[PDB]
C-alpha cells in the first residue's frame, strides 16, 4: 500500500512528498512539516528519510525548494 515512510499512514486522498531517487521514500505533509522544522534549524532540508538521497542524474543530495517548503508549511 502507498504509505508514508515515517509514520506509515496511507497516502490516498492526501498530498505527499516523493523522493526523486528512491520511489519508496514518500512522506505525508505532517511528517514533512516536522522534518522541515528539524532540518531547517541547521541548513538545507534533505530527504525526510535522513538518507540524503541524490538528485536523479547528479551526485548531490536533493533538497526542498523554497516554494515546496512554503506549500507544505502553509497548512491544509
Amino acid at each position: 500500500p502507498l504509505c508514508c515512510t515515517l509514520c506509515h499512514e496511507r497516502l490516498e486522498d492526501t498530498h505527499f512528498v516523493q523522493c526523486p531517487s528512491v520511489p519508496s521514500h514518500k512522506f505525508c505533509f505532517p511528517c514533512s512539516r516536522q522534518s522541515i522544522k528539524q532540518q531547517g534549524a541547521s541548513g538545507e532540508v534533505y530527504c525526510p528519510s535522513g538518507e540524503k538521497c541524490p538528485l536523479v542524474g547528479s551526485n548531490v543530495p536533493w533538497a526542498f525548494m523554497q516554494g515546496e517548503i512554503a506549500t507544505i508549511l502553509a497548512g491544509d
Binding site: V17, Q18, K26, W62, E68, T71
Partner: peptide, 6 residues
C-alpha cells in the same frame, strides 16, 4: 527537476 509534491 520536477516538484516533489504529489
Amino acid at each position: 527537476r520536477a516538484s516533489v509534491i504529489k
